[PDB]
Amino acid sequence: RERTVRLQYGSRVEAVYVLGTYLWTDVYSAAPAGAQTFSLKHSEHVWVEVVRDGEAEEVATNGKQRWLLSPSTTLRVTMSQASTEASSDKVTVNYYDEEGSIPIDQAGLFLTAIEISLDVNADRDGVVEKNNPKKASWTWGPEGQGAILLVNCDRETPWLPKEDCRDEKVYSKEDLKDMSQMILRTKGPDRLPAGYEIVLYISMSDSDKVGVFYVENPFFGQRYIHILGRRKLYHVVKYTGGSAELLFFVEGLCFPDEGFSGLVSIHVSLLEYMAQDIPLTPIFTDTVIFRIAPWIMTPNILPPVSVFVCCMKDNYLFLKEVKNLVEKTNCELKVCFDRWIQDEIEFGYIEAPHKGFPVVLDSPRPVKELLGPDFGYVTREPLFESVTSLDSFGNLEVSPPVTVNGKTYPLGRILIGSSFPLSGGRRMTKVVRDFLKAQQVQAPVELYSDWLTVGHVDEFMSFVPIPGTKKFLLLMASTSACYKLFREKQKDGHGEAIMFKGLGGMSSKRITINKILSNESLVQENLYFQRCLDWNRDILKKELGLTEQDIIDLPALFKMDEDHRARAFFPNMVNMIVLDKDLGIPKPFGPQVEEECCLEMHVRGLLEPLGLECTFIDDISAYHKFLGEVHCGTNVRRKPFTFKWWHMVPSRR
Amino acid sequence: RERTVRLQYGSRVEAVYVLGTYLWTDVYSAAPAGAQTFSLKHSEHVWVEVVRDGEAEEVATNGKQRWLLSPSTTLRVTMSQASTEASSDKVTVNYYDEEGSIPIDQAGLFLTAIEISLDVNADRDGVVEKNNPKKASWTWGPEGQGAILLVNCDRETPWLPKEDCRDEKVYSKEDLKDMSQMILRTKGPDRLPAGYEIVLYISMSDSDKVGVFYVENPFFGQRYIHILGRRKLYHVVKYTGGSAELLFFVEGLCFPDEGFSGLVSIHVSLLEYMAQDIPLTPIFTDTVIFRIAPWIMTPNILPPVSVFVCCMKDNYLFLKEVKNLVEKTNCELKVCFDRWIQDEIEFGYIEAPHKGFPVVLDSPRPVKELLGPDFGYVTREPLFESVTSLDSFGNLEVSPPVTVNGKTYPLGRILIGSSFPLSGGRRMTKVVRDFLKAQQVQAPVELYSDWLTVGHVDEFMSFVPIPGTKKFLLLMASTSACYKLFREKQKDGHGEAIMFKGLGGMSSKRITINKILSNESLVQENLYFQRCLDWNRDILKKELGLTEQDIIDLPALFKMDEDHRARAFFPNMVNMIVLDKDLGIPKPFGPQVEEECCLEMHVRGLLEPLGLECTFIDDISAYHKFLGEVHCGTNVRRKPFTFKWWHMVPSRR
Ligand SMILES: [Ca+2]
Ligand SMILES: [Ca+2]
Ligand SMILES: [Ca+2]
Ligand SMILES: [Ca+2]
Ligand SMILES: [Ca+2]
Ligand SMILES: [Ca+2]
Ligand SMILES: [Ca+2]
Ligand SMILES: [Ca+2]
Ligand SMILES: [Ca+2]
Ligand SMILES: [Ca+2]
């Protein structure tokens, strides 16, 4: 960076020189009228070139050399080391007229060199390198560069209800571990010359996206000063001489969203005092950029950590069977004593090179009771648009990593259910959709859920890993598979086999395979629902790059309501608890053949050959009947992907 | 694209097949209970594969071959040509049980194949190619692809005041020439099968960004039907059999802006009727994308077309000298009988492969009187923020094409004046700044103008081409050059030479070189203004990739007001009319030495050796005095860049 500093006619110029720049210096304007030639002297640590019409020539500390005065003959002035108290750094120019070799005038430039660098960890290793030349840019990918910031959305101490970033204060040094480091490094003499100050600042726009703290250690203990952030746009830095560092800690306050890309900037400037009533002149400015880390969902293929379960205290079979299942694994079971754990919350995570933690997304209106140390919270509330069943998080899921026609999605793709574009049907609120899209690294896909009364993708589809491989299966509800199976059992002499055996509230109904197969309107409804499933099958195959070999169909059956929307006839087996090879599967209560449920045996026959272990879990017996509704919920918290989100290269927006 | 179509148990399935897709067909669900094997027949133009667990085998039209019935044994069905009236396209499956070789049941699939393609000119040659595989994407650069749309902002007929895009109507066939073509191409039999329709549609969001028209030729003359746009989100297409094309014309309604990237989409779907009260199922969907062309500024290096001039009818010297200047060139002179032509308007342009026209940007509040055929209009009005002098377009300029540290800016970079970040000073309104940034291809740079009372970049800087080369110069106002010159003339014995000779309203002042040089406070003010100029010099060198060899300094002088802001002491020569080698330069009225203005002679000495021809133009004599204000204005309308904006690759936003 070249900077203009002119000698001044009949006076001496004093200037601060910032290392990493160089000066071009006009000596002509300061020459007396009628002066012919000039010479120069300079000190040891100042390098001086005389530049004539672009041609540069190095000059000694004291020579006698003279050059013709011309507007096109100038100096280039460079310094490679900061000034100390022992320094006198200067360039002096002598002027001469045509008569005589004694100078008729002198103009000079007295310099104080300092180093100023605002440094961050741009190379993403967790340590703050000195002046990364890429620190002012942010690039995606394995070779990409630039610093990363976490939204500090967890809560360090329980005393306050709100997340850490909702205020301007830091109470606890544990909070600093969530924050990115930024160091202002300087080198120079005991003080800045008269008329200069160093100032850190941010734009008004970024002031609700960040906060920046400095740690002081006064007499009675450590304290945390908020120097940039909400309603503080600048901070005058206290300068210390010699080689010095000021350590700052930076927190993000906001996730990327509609209208906010996630990028924020922080600046430091050296300012020069001109006079009262006149603005200070930025002499030098250094900038760093941060990208705020996106919220990321976890697919069923990722290792389970904790199984969260909600049910009534007296549903004993459910609790017993869920505990049994989890005991086969290394997971924690967490129980709360009705679908809210599935519908109101989605467990995501955030990650930066220095730290990461799980973060809950809260569905639009006691889930804020999950907020705690290294467990974060985020929510979006529609300001205008009304919430529908499609805003519930049974309608929010995510695929395993996929490659679709050469395009890699290393974090998978978010899936949310919707209605056809021209249908006038339900759709998840724009505010939530906009939020998921803005995270960018999960590239969301809309499926068709609005044929279902509740309207959730988890009613019809799920993913499971294939044990001992890197692969996975798509599981789809299928009415055609159910009808095929029941027609086979009927042919085999089982048509009088009864559904829902043991649910006392259903006994008067006596539902049999025969009764199901002879219900003509139910057949037509389910043919239509199969068309709805197949439409989804096609979009999943297209957008996930799946073939028929990647899909397994589980028998399912639905009843139609007055809106021509589907609800489960028997419990939907596809929405299941997936812990690696072990699957909690809702107990279907299907027709008994030889004292085994034919739906259970059929499902085992599909899954077991692949090394999957099935446990059927009964949530409905405590209610004595099944009306299409589920009274329990589970949500599995999983380990984050090994792949770092910042190594992705998302498509241009 | 693979699509799911199942045979139906005990019934025949009729389906439309869209060319470019293929069907995967379940034959198992339709088999009677207890059936063992199946065989198949198919017609001539239907290709059928039996796929067993992923392994595909082609099958004859009539063979006797039988396969085991399995859920994993399916059909793949493909057609390569559209159905005609002579077609019977079908696949029939026979089922058999273990006893006997006579079929016990039959299921079949009757197909009608059609071609549906929504086509645009994605390869940007002006003609609409058939089904460009990249038509649904938009990519920048020489190898980039996707269709381009103009904002149709001009006005075809004078009868209505507003721009063409402000309504839903097309009056004149000339209007269609501004529009991009889109063709829906189809092939098929006399009619679509029962229950199907084809529909064009757009999102609610895009509905204020586009309009789409169809030309009908009824009995009494050509008419224009608006089929998509404001308050019309879909249009049911009238289907014609055989090979058919429907030609549509697409207009943009809005420039890229804050919150609108410029990309819009149009879809066509084949929809299937299910039953009353149930939404129609999209069977097939095809999409095209358009990018709306940005508004682009023209730098002084581009060929002049028309010189627009505003002044009073009696300023005779001005008109005479401007006419003289323009007569040296091929330009039109257009005169309107006070700075509004410079301050209220900026002449830009828009371009698409099929057409381009100039477009005026109107500064925030009779410039709408420029609206006409192939002369467009656009404006931005702050909803809240107050307008200041910095919103005037003397504060809006653009550089010649530059390369800055390996990064090419083939259209140049927009330059607008501002104040220092921490100053609390004036800044151009956000709405206009956001608009310029959103055009993206001119990558705007803010300079420091707020040290000037009026606050415009054109007060201190301009660009000129260097004749006979591809290069250009930056011209900067310089107070140091003026002081050097005056001090030389004083030494030469000219100190009593007077400014403003011949302006009768200034005669009582008797301003001399001596009087100027001995005014101590004026010297200090101008040293400070030179620091303001030099700060700008440094930013221009950095952001335009310029060296000292690219810059010429023109003598200038300012007076300071109560706000510590500068106004011209004598007319600012840097703001000049540039027509290639010929320069209209405001007459400075400087000190006369040997009956020539020493400022004029000095400027000629700088410019003339480069092949530039200087004409000094006097706008102030008609006013008898100079107070720092200019009473005339000029704006030059230029030819667009040869480089196509779509060949640029702007940085990721
Ligand atoms: Ca590092
Ligand atoms: Ca806090
Ligand atoms: Ca925290
Ligand atoms: Ca924490
Ligand atoms: Ca979910
Ligand atoms: Ca073309
Ligand atoms: Ca119109
Ligand atoms: Ca038009
Ligand atoms: Ca036109
Ligand atoms: Ca302008």
Side-chain angles (χ1 to χ4, degrees), chain A residues 2-40 42-52 54-97 100-159 161-172 174-222 224-237 239-275 277-312 314-364 366-380 382-469 471-509 511-558 560-628 630-652, chain B residues 2-40 42-52 54-97 100-159 161-172 174-222 224-237 239-275 277-312 314-364 366-380 382-469 471-509 511-558 560-628 630-652:
Chain A
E2 187 172 53
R3 167 186 166 214
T4 301
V5 177
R6 307 183 183 266
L7 300 195
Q8 188 163 124
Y9 174 79
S11 184
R12 117 245 241 103
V13 173
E14 300 184 36
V16 172
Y17 179 109
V18 181
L19 293 186
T21 72
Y22 66 90
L23 310 182
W24 86 266
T25 295
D26 159 23
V27 308
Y28 183 66
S29 300
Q36 179 184 69
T37 63
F38 74 98
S39 68
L40 70 92
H42 67 80
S43 59
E44 177 188 342
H45 299 132
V46 181
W47 303 343
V48 177
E49 294 162 295
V50 166
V51 183
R52 303 136 94 170
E55 287 308 286
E57 172 193 5
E58 260 187 283
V59 184
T61 54
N62 197 7
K64 295 176 184 159
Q65 183 162 0
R66 277 176 295 187
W67 296 265
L68 237 46
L69 278 163
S70 171
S72 70
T73 294
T74 63
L75 305 190
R76 189 154 66 216
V77 178
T78 313
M79 298 182 68
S80 51
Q81 71 185 61
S83 298
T84 73
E85 290 303 306
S87 299
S88 319
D89 304 296
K90 49 177 176 172
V91 181
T92 300
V93 170
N94 289 128
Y95 301 105
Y96 307 84
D97 52 26
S101 300
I102 307 300
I104 61 176
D105 202 15
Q106 168 171 303
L109 177 63
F110 289 0
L111 298 163
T112 295
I114 66 185
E115 183 179 350
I116 302 171
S117 186
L118 188 62
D119 295 342
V120 292
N121 164 43
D123 58 26
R124 306 160 179 178
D125 67 5
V127 186
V128 173
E129 66 271 21
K130 295 176 164 51
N131 199 15
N132 190 321
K134 294 180 285 186
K135 69 190 189 192
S137 301
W138 207 98
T139 53
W140 291 92
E143 319 303 328
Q145 206 93 156
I148 293 174
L149 185 57
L150 292 182
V151 177
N152 178 20
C153 59
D154 65 341
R155 184 188 62 193
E156 300 303 333
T157 57
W159 318 113
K162 295 195 294 173
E163 324 94 83
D164 291 333
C165 55
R166 291 294 105 219
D167 67 10
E168 302 77 61
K169 274 68 187 170
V170 164
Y171 305 103
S172 156
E174 271 323 279
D175 198 26
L176 305 177
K177 294 174 178 186
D178 298 326
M179 297 192 195
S180 308
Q181 294 169 24
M182 176 177 67
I183 301 170
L184 176 65
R185 294 187 170 107
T186 61
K187 191 153 178 288
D190 291 350
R191 66 196 52 91
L192 296 179
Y196 296 90
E197 65 176 359
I198 292 168
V199 181
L200 288 163
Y201 67 95
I202 56 172
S203 67
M204 176 66 181
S205 183
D206 287 343
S207 76
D208 69 351
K209 320 294 198 303
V210 297
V212 175
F213 292 86
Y214 174 80
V215 178
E216 291 193 314
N217 301 278
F219 199 100
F220 291 105
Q222 195 161 93
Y224 313 96
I225 314 305
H226 174 250
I227 66 134
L228 294 170
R230 299 192 181 93
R231 304 177 303 272
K232 187 112 148 45
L233 306 185
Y234 69 86
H235 186 80
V236 173
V237 173
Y239 169 84
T240 296
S243 186
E245 292 190 352
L246 294 159
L247 177 63
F248 303 95
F249 294 86
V250 185
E251 65 174 354
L253 315 180
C254 183
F255 278 92
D257 212 326
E258 185 75 6
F260 174 50
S261 78
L263 295 174
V264 297
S265 300
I266 303 176
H267 311 281
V268 64
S269 283
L270 178 70
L271 305 181
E272 181 184 339
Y273 182 81
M274 308 300 289
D277 302 323
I278 290 193
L280 283 82
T281 305
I283 294 315
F284 166 85
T285 299
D286 201 25
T287 299
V288 297
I289 187 170
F290 285 100
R291 171 177 288 283
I292 292 178
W295 183 76
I296 303 167
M297 291 178 57
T298 57
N300 289 351
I301 58 101
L302 289 183
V305 181
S306 300
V307 180
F308 290 76
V309 161
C310 68
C311 63
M312 55 185 188
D314 70 336
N315 194 336
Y316 294 129
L317 274 185
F318 179 76
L319 286 163
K320 167 194 183 65
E321 290 159 357
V322 167
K323 178 148 97 67
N324 284 339
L325 172 68
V326 170
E327 283 172 0
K328 300 192 61 180
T329 80
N330 280 323
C331 308
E332 294 199 50
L333 180 59
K334 302 185 177 183
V335 179
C336 179
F337 297 133
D338 45 28
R339 264 274 217 218
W340 76 271
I341 201 44
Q342 240 171 284
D343 288 331
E344 302 193 34
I345 90 98
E346 186 68 50
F347 292 120
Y349 71 91
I350 60 173
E351 187 180 8
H354 60 280
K355 181 88 184 269
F357 53 79
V359 174
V360 174
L361 177 68
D362 183 11
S363 78
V367 359
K368 205 148 174 175
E369 300 307 284
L370 291 169
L371 173 63
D374 291 344
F375 214 92
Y377 175 93
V378 59
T379 190
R380 284 295 181 277
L383 304 176
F384 295 100
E385 186 176 4
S386 290
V387 178
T388 75
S389 183
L390 275 65
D391 291 292
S392 279
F393 291 165
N395 198 35
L396 174 61
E397 301 293 324
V398 61
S399 81
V402 283
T403 292
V404 187
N405 39 73
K407 165 75 176 177
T408 306
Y409 293 92
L411 308 177
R413 304 188 70 182
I414 281 172
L415 308 167
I416 59 182
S418 189
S419 50
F420 299 144
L422 303 177
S423 66
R426 299 174 296 173
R427 194 176 185 187
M428 176 182 283
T429 52
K430 170 165 180 60
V431 60
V432 181
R433 288 189 287 106
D434 283 356
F435 170 86
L436 299 166
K437 167 173 65 163
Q439 300 323 294
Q440 282 188 86
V441 293
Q442 295 169 318
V445 172
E446 280 182 305
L447 307 178
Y448 174 40
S449 74
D450 198 35
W451 59 277
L452 288 145
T453 299
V454 176
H456 299 174
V457 292
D458 75 353
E459 289 177 277
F460 70 90
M461 49 146 289
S462 180
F463 296 97
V464 294
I466 297 173
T469 74
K471 307 180 61 221
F472 66 93
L473 294 170
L474 171 61
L475 304 187
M476 292 285 296
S478 170
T479 74
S480 62
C482 195
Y483 276 93
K484 184 57 152 197
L485 177 61
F486 285 1
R487 291 178 175 129
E488 292 289 326
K489 297 301 160 184
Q490 179 182 63
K491 180 71 147 54
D492 300 344
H494 303 111
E496 288 295 308
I498 181 146
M499 298 278 309
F500 308 122
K501 189 171 176 60
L503 298 174
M506 307 189 80
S507 295
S508 56
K509 303 172 189 283
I511 304 164
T512 61
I513 290 175
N514 285 331
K515 188 173 180 305
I516 291 169
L517 293 177
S518 68
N519 179 338
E520 300 166 39
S521 64
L522 185 64
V523 176
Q524 299 304 308
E525 294 168 2
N526 282 276
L527 285 171
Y528 165 70
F529 298 141
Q530 187 61 55
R531 285 285 309 272
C532 299
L533 296 159
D534 291 343
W535 196 91
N536 281 288
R537 188 195 203 86
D538 298 343
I539 190 151
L540 289 157
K541 289 164 68 173
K542 168 184 182 179
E543 301 286 343
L544 309 180
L546 301 181
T547 74
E548 283 299 312
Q549 281 62 61
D550 297 311
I551 310 176
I552 288 191
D553 291 283
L554 304 178
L557 201 60
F558 305 93
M560 183 178 278
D561 66 19
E562 302 95 326
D563 289 316
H564 312 272
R565 293 195 177 103
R567 67 184 178 278
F569 188 104
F570 62 79
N572 286 322
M573 290 187 279
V574 66
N575 186 190
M576 59 175 70
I577 311 171
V578 180
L579 318 163
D580 301 328
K581 69 175 165 58
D582 290 279
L583 306 183
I585 306 172
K587 188 180 202 68
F589 289 86
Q592 300 271 123
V593 179
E594 303 306 327
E595 294 84 76
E596 297 291 350
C597 176
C598 68
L599 293 163
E600 293 182 10
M601 298 302 99
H602 180 84
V603 170
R604 290 191 185 277
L606 295 172
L607 307 182
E608 295 188 343
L610 308 174
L612 293 161
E613 301 173 35
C614 301
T615 303
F616 292 95
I617 294 189
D618 169 1
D619 41 34
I620 73 182
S621 282
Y623 300 89
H624 310 286
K625 58 180 177 280
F626 179 74
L627 291 333
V630 190
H631 302 290
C632 306
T634 67
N635 208 329
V636 177
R637 208 280 279 174
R638 304 185 183 271
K639 294 183 176 181
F641 286 100
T642 298
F643 190 90
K644 308 306 195 187
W645 63 266
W646 57 89
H647 288 153
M648 189 168 170
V649 189
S651 304
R652 293 174 68 119
Chain B
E2 187 172 53
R3 167 186 166 214
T4 301
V5 177
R6 307 183 183 266
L7 300 195
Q8 188 163 124
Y9 174 79
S11 184
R12 117 245 241 103
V13 173
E14 300 184 36
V16 172
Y17 179 109
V18 181
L19 293 186
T21 72
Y22 66 90
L23 310 182
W24 86 266
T25 295
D26 159 23
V27 308
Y28 183 66
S29 300
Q36 179 184 69
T37 63
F38 74 98
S39 68
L40 70 92
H42 67 80
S43 59
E44 177 188 342
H45 299 132
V46 181
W47 303 343
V48 177
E49 294 162 295
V50 166
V51 183
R52 303 136 94 170
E55 287 308 286
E57 172 193 5
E58 260 187 283
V59 184
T61 54
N62 197 7
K64 295 176 184 159
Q65 183 162 0
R66 277 176 295 187
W67 296 265
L68 237 46
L69 278 163
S70 171
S72 70
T73 294
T74 63
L75 305 190
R76 189 154 66 216
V77 178
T78 313
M79 298 182 68
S80 51
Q81 71 185 61
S83 298
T84 73
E85 290 303 306
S87 299
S88 319
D89 304 296
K90 49 177 176 172
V91 181
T92 300
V93 170
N94 289 128
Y95 301 105
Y96 307 84
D97 52 26
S101 300
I102 307 300
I104 61 176
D105 202 15
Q106 168 171 303
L109 177 63
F110 289 0
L111 298 163
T112 295
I114 66 185
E115 183 179 350
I116 302 171
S117 186
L118 188 62
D119 295 342
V120 292
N121 164 43
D123 58 26
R124 306 160 179 178
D125 67 5
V127 186
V128 173
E129 66 271 21
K130 295 176 164 51
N131 199 15
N132 190 321
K134 294 180 285 186
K135 69 190 189 192
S137 301
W138 207 98
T139 53
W140 291 92
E143 319 303 328
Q145 206 93 156
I148 293 174
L149 185 57
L150 292 182
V151 177
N152 178 20
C153 59
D154 65 341
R155 184 188 62 193
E156 300 303 333
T157 57
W159 318 113
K162 295 195 294 173
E163 324 94 83
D164 291 333
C165 55
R166 291 294 105 219
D167 67 10
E168 302 77 61
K169 274 68 187 170
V170 164
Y171 305 103
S172 156
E174 271 323 279
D175 198 26
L176 305 177
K177 294 174 178 186
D178 298 326
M179 297 192 195
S180 308
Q181 294 169 24
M182 176 177 67
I183 301 170
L184 176 65
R185 294 187 170 107
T186 61
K187 191 153 178 288
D190 291 350
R191 66 196 52 91
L192 296 179
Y196 296 90
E197 65 176 359
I198 292 168
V199 181
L200 288 163
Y201 67 95
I202 56 172
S203 67
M204 176 66 181
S205 183
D206 287 343
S207 76
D208 69 351
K209 320 294 198 303
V210 297
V212 175
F213 292 86
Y214 174 80
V215 178
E216 291 193 314
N217 301 278
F219 199 100
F220 291 105
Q222 195 161 93
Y224 313 96
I225 314 305
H226 174 250
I227 66 134
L228 294 170
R230 299 192 181 93
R231 304 177 303 272
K232 187 112 148 45
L233 306 185
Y234 69 86
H235 186 80
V236 173
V237 173
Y239 169 84
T240 296
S243 186
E245 292 190 352
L246 294 159
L247 177 63
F248 303 95
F249 294 86
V250 185
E251 65 174 354
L253 315 180
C254 183
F255 278 92
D257 212 326
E258 185 75 6
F260 174 50
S261 78
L263 295 174
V264 297
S265 300
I266 303 176
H267 311 281
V268 64
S269 283
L270 178 70
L271 305 181
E272 181 184 339
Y273 182 81
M274 308 300 289
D277 302 323
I278 290 193
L280 283 82
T281 305
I283 294 315
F284 166 85
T285 299
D286 201 25
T287 299
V288 297
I289 187 170
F290 285 100
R291 171 177 288 283
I292 292 178
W295 183 76
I296 303 167
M297 291 178 57
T298 57
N300 289 351
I301 58 101
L302 289 183
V305 181
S306 300
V307 180
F308 290 76
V309 161
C310 68
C311 63
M312 55 185 188
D314 70 336
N315 194 336
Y316 294 129
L317 274 185
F318 179 76
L319 286 163
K320 167 194 183 65
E321 290 159 357
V322 167
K323 178 148 97 67
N324 284 339
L325 172 68
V326 170
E327 283 172 0
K328 300 192 61 180
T329 80
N330 280 323
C331 308
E332 294 199 50
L333 180 59
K334 302 185 177 183
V335 179
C336 179
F337 297 133
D338 45 28
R339 264 274 217 218
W340 76 271
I341 201 44
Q342 240 171 284
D343 288 331
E344 302 193 34
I345 90 98
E346 186 68 50
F347 292 120
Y349 71 91
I350 60 173
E351 187 180 8
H354 60 280
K355 181 88 184 269
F357 53 79
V359 174
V360 174
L361 177 68
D362 183 11
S363 78
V367 359
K368 205 148 174 175
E369 300 307 284
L370 291 169
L371 173 63
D374 291 344
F375 214 92
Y377 175 93
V378 59
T379 190
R380 284 295 181 277
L383 304 176
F384 295 100
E385 186 176 4
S386 290
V387 178
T388 75
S389 183
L390 275 65
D391 291 292
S392 279
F393 291 165
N395 198 35
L396 174 61
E397 301 293 324
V398 61
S399 81
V402 283
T403 292
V404 187
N405 39 73
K407 165 75 176 177
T408 306
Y409 293 92
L411 308 177
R413 304 188 70 182
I414 281 172
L415 308 167
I416 59 182
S418 189
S419 50
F420 299 144
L422 303 177
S423 66
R426 299 174 296 173
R427 194 176 185 187
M428 176 182 283
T429 52
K430 170 165 180 60
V431 60
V432 181
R433 288 189 287 106
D434 283 356
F435 170 86
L436 299 166
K437 167 173 65 163
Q439 300 323 294
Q440 282 188 86
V441 293
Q442 295 169 318
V445 172
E446 280 182 305
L447 307 178
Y448 174 40
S449 74
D450 198 35
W451 59 277
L452 288 145
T453 299
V454 176
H456 299 174
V457 292
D458 75 353
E459 289 177 277
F460 70 90
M461 49 146 289
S462 180
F463 296 97
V464 294
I466 297 173
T469 74
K471 307 180 61 221
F472 66 93
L473 294 170
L474 171 61
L475 304 187
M476 292 285 296
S478 170
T479 74
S480 62
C482 195
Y483 276 93
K484 184 57 152 197
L485 177 61
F486 285 1
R487 291 178 175 129
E488 292 289 326
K489 297 301 160 184
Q490 179 182 63
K491 180 71 147 54
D492 300 344
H494 303 111
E496 288 295 308
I498 181 146
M499 298 278 309
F500 308 122
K501 189 171 176 60
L503 298 174
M506 307 189 80
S507 295
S508 56
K509 303 172 189 283
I511 304 164
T512 61
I513 290 175
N514 285 331
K515 188 173 180 305
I516 291 169
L517 293 177
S518 68
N519 179 338
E520 300 166 39
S521 64
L522 185 64
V523 176
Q524 299 304 308
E525 294 168 2
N526 282 276
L527 285 171
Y528 165 70
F529 298 141
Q530 187 61 55
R531 285 285 309 272
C532 299
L533 296 159
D534 291 343
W535 196 91
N536 281 288
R537 188 195 203 86
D538 298 343
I539 190 151
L540 289 157
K541 289 164 68 173
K542 168 184 182 179
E543 301 286 343
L544 309 180
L546 301 181
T547 74
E548 283 299 312
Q549 281 62 61
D550 297 311
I551 310 176
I552 288 191
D553 291 283
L554 304 178
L557 201 60
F558 305 93
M560 183 178 278
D561 66 19
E562 302 95 326
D563 289 316
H564 312 272
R565 293 195 177 103
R567 67 184 178 278
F569 188 104
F570 62 79
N572 286 322
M573 290 187 279
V574 66
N575 186 190
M576 59 175 70
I577 311 171
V578 180
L579 318 163
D580 301 328
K581 69 175 165 58
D582 290 279
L583 306 183
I585 306 172
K587 188 180 202 68
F589 289 86
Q592 300 271 123
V593 179
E594 303 306 327
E595 294 84 76
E596 297 291 350
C597 176
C598 68
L599 293 163
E600 293 182 10
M601 298 302 99
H602 180 84
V603 170
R604 290 191 185 277
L606 295 172
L607 307 182
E608 295 188 343
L610 308 174
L612 293 161
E613 301 173 35
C614 301
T615 303
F616 292 95
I617 294 189
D618 169 1
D619 41 34
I620 73 182
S621 282
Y623 300 89
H624 310 286
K625 58 180 177 280
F626 179 74
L627 291 333
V630 190
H631 302 290
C632 306
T634 67
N635 208 329
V636 177
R637 208 280 279 174
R638 304 185 183 271
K639 294 183 176 181
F641 286 100
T642 298
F643 190 90
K644 308 306 195 187
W645 63 266
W646 57 89
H647 288 153
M648 189 168 170
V649 189
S651 304
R652 293 174 68 119

